[PDB]
Design a protein around this ligand. Structure first.
Ligand SMILES: Nc1ncnc2c1ncn2[C@@H]1O[C@@H]2COP(=O)(O)O[C@H]3[C@@H](O)[C@H](n4cnc5c(N)ncnc54)O[C@@H]3COP(=O)(O)O[C@H]2[C@H]1O
Ligand SMILES: Nc1ncnc2c1ncn2[C@@H]1O[C@@H]2COP(=O)(O)O[C@H]3[C@@H](O)[C@H](n4cnc5c(N)ncnc54)O[C@@H]3COP(=O)(O)O[C@H]2[C@H]1O
Ligand SMILES: [Cl-]
Ligand SMILES: [Cl-]
Ligand SMILES: [Cl-]
Ligand SMILES: [Cl-]
Ligand SMILES: [Cl-]
Ligand SMILES: [Cl-]
Lengths: 349, 348, 347, 349
């Protein structure tokens, strides 16, 4: 069945449905619309007339001038019933108020399809999707909220970049501590979560979100890769993290509450380090996956064999060119390319 | 309850504010008592007694009826609806109309907040014991507050610029009253706009959560800066007492916005002459600001050094051994202070 | 009075505007006369005579009634309500309808402002002696003004960049007339946008308080910069007198928007020839702008030094002792100026 | 006869017509207005009053209080009929909804003049011109759309500046590649295209767009010159590109689709380089137009003479003041000026 997020996109600006709903609001008639029709919807439909017409925003507005509910086909392409009386099972729980909205949420739960009720008194559109509710919001209000969020994301992007530069500099110096790594982890997560908030606003804005999508893609882009590499570099298990294990760790980070992300001990637990104060002060050593990823055209197969042999970035830097040609599966030309790239880390700082 | 407390109870994100927004869209009007006891019952006439949990939808429906709705003190319950309030007509009020005059009188007599919604004006007014506040749409508040935050970040840049100028002048040993009062004015301007933004943030409720973090970051350190500059350049010859510092800052707040534009007005608060020649006369900081820049240096240590040497220049000429001669300053701290002072001089 | 004075009297935050806002929400319409004398009484017909203190609520309630409300000149009292205005029909007007045509005719005949509120259009119009102004909701003005602020921030950025280029040229001793006038154009462009936004602040009244803080900070120092550039690059060999400086600034304001794009028109205001060949001729700064760049140096001191040495190059080559034998400059300010100048050259 | 874009201009803010339409919307009367009168319009006109009065916003509002349609003269200066019943040929096809709007578009097609319908229920203005339709939008909504675009244009302008500075660094070092040149070409085009979008909003805004016009011209200022200079520097033709050749290249760039702009090989084709991915790594040598433009006070006329004489930026850097004063039209003063201006770039990067 459609999910709450799917319904929100289907009612977003730029869609045929949203054009009809905008028309209904201006007419102040109210409405009750079922986004789907099957045998289950028929069971709760009572009376009304059957019509078979192509969906049109103008047609929807006219039919919703009538008392009752309008039913659309599942694909949303046709209007099949109008002036219908919904009779959903009263035992289905709902916290809505009044016959119209209580009938709407109950019908949404019983049939499994989205149901829209528009209040003539309040000029509000509500969509019910299987026990969840979404209230449409003015595109101006969403834009104002999203642009402030974009402003916060730009600041999160600036602080992320500088703490990231500090971490890399410490990696060369061999003076990285667990707390420093969790400072970068915290900033990557903060960037990700505010990014998700803006993403939901972009979806809700529909065509009115096109420009916001472009801004969001630049600010975020590369956030997923940075989170994956940092888990790959600083995870407590002696074995280099598997790709699936990395996704498990990242999923644990997402499970943390917004408040927990401010707690460096909680993050330390997600990477397998102890939660103690002393653990934060302890010095770590990067595994080196991030450095290899920066080397152009170096397939991860060659990076995993080298990282497994030497273990740490300092071991990779301490290796000679011949030491990088004595690893099984690494060529002579590849050994030269990796050694030169690590020397460019000296060029970095 | 205070008026600001009442405004918080009606702020966005509360059940009450949800109900009031619904009432406004219904254009029904309302007259709501936020509390119930024997005194309220005395002024209640007719109506229904009911015992239901508060809900925005329930409040909207009940206010469709003529009369008033009374809630429990905690706001969790609706206890009566359709009530006729009859507060003592002798209680004075300058409100207009039966509903609003009855609302303010009821607020005064019972001591609880009373809300009246005008169907004609679509305005929410809350009365708390002779004071009034009219709600403002969150949209207007957000736009107004964002200009204020934008201006405040710019005032914060200007404050940093004049502060570095003062520190450089302090090291150079050529500081004039005018240079100090430029910093005093910028500190106060940041503070006052900060207070303005704070009131809007409170009124915004949940819609002010993001703006609150921005405000706390921009302001942070303003109180310490105001205390320190008073402590360094106050006319009183003995270093200012904690009570004197708090008194001066209260006087600075008492000045009008126009007075903050008058450097002579600021100089009077600091105890200096109001003449124009005073703005040009030189002064010497005590050194509290410099010591505060020293990491890990407890204020108690800085106070002993300032009383011994008297001025920042006396501290800068003091050797590390010379700073182990005052009782209460150890050898390690003495090296740490001299090292810090020499670093401070080079930076300017 | 004037139309601008009336708009101030009707600005947000005033008792009058509060009543008008209440009338607009009530959608009753209104016809209000801001003044009472014999000429008004001649035009008043029927109605009730009352003498009450003005309050926004009182104006709203009285304007629910058909007819017109008359206020005292100072605006402190309501003197008539439900009155019929009967201005001389020979008085010409291009307004539409009985109410608005009666409003303008009454404004012309009596000389006081007259306000009409349209129930159909929910628009407030004030008539002052043959002129018309329509009040605008504070939201619309704020949006209009913020667009102007966006332009102003870009113009301030362009002004800062060209100003730093000019100052760098002053140190290099190779400054041309066209360079100076490039800064002159950008200073004027910033000013003109500033004037437009300032007008929106006035109409906004109390709703413009935040826009005033933002506007004053962005403009801040622009008037001072316009004075300093005139003081540095004005034809007259003697440093321009305060009367000459104000005259130059007044001529710039008189220029049309189109003239500002032409540097030769700007050159004329400063007393230089309009020929393009002149735009390539090198100039010598007096040093007012450079001295203004020195932190903490008040213009009293800066002016004494600039008048003594004559040119910025003379200031740069002066020792600390050379800047102490100018009466009015002590040892401390002479040293501070010497160091401040060396910083500019070194950077 | 009026075209769709021309008609929208006649209804733009600041016009007498748009003032009248704004009055109609506030009055909630609805309207049906024909912008033109000839034999064909009269043919479809039925009943009503014939009047000859000058157009005024107020006069239009009052006349539209009556049932029916108002006809204006072709020049728009007069109101010629009111209370008219339009009877367009019903065979003319239309997909509009309702008697008023379907009658409006049919009349627009049959007579060839613009026709305006105002919905009393929806408070929406639609203009029909020969099978095309446009719905007017409140100036606030257009401004909101345009300010989002201005924000993106601010991000593209910053990104353009940084890659341009990177290209400038490479030009001095003589380590430029096609990929470096095409990164700047792409960023120049993105700024240009978003700028064109904002320009259309300025036109639709009429007088309400004057400030947006000032801001837009400031941000876009210099973008055209940058596009010309980069073509002048890195065009595959051996001789410096011709003026018509430059115009041809920029026209091809405009012809590219948005997706093609994301293809560096697509941009390489326009400049005349090979379309292969390998070609992106080939080294290029700039002619020096861009660097000379960075020199203060240097008129392009003189830079064109120097660039054609020496051929490459590296040749210009190696040139002495005497070498730069042997080009006709380059004096001693300008030879010195360019000589120091180039040696300052060499040191800075
Ligand atoms: N001598 C005349 N010639 C032609 N048409 C006439 C007229 N007198 C009245 N009307 C028409 O009757 C409408 C309603 O007039 P009423 O006196 O009810 O309502 C009036 C009255 O309450 C007030 N108003 C208009 N002119 C006034 C004046 N000179 N003095 C006082 N009140 C005035 O404004 C209301 C609406 O005026 P509006 O012009 O919109 O609407 C006017 C106008 O269209
Ligand atoms: N032949 C027909 N077939 C089916 N339904 C019909 C019809 N003629 C009228 N109606 C219905 O009656 C409504 C009111 O018609 P009325 O002529 O009063 O009000 C009309 C008339 O004043 C004007 N209008 C519509 N078509 C026109 C035309 N061809 N020429 C001139 N005026 C027109 O616009 C008003 C509103 O039009 P709208 O369609 O919204 O509203 C129409 C439409 O819903
Ligand atoms: Cl629509
Ligand atoms: Cl709501
Ligand atoms: Cl009220
Ligand atoms: Cl109000
Ligand atoms: Cl009359
Ligand atoms: Cl329609």
């Amino acid at each position: 069945r459609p999910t709450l997020r799917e319904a929100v996109a289907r009612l977003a600006p730029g869609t045929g449905l949203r054009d009809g709903l905008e028309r209904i609001l201006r007419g102040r008639t109210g409405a009750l619309i079922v986004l789907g029709h099957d045998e289950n919807v028929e069971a709760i439909c009572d009376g009304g007339f059957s019509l078979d017409v192509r969906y049109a925003a103008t047609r929807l507005r006219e039919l919703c001038k009538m008392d009752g509910a309008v039913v659309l086909s599942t694909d949303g392409s046709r209007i099949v019933r109008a002036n219908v009386q919904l009779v959903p099972d009263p035992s289905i729980p709902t916290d809505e108020s009044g016959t119209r909205h209580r009938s709407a949420e109950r019908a949404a739960i019983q049939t499994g399809y989205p149901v829209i009720s528009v209040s003539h008194s309040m000029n509000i559109v509500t969509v019910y999707v299987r026990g969840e509710r979404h209230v449409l919001t003015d595109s101006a209000t969403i834009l104002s909220r999203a642009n402030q969020a974009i402003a916060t994301l730009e600041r999160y992007k600036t602080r992320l970049d500088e703490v990231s530069r500090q971490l890399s500099r410490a990696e060369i110096e061999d003076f990285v501590t667990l707390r420093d790594v969790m400072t970068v982890v915290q900033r990557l997560e903060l960037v990700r979560r505010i990014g998700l908030v803006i993403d939901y606003d972009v979806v809700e804005l529909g065509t009115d979100g096109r420009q916001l999508r472009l801004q969001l893609d630049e600010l975020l882009g590369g956030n997923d890769t940075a989170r994956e590499l940092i888990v790959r570099d600083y995870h407590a298990n002696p074995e280099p993290p598997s790709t699936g294990q990395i996704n498990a760790t990242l999923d644990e980070l997402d499970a943390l509450s917004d408040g927990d992300l401010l707690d460096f001990t909680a993050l330390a637990k997600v990477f397998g380090y102890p939660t103690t104060t002393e653990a934060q002060d302890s010095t770590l050593s990067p595994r080196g996956y991030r450095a290899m990823a920066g080397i152009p055209r170096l397939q991860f197969a060659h990076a995993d064999l080298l990282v497994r042999a030497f273990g740490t970035l300092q071991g990779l830097l301490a290796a000679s060119a011949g030491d990088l040609q004595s690893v099984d599966g690494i060529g002579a030309m590849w050994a030269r390319h990796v050694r030169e790239g690590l020397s460019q880390l000296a060029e970095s700082t």
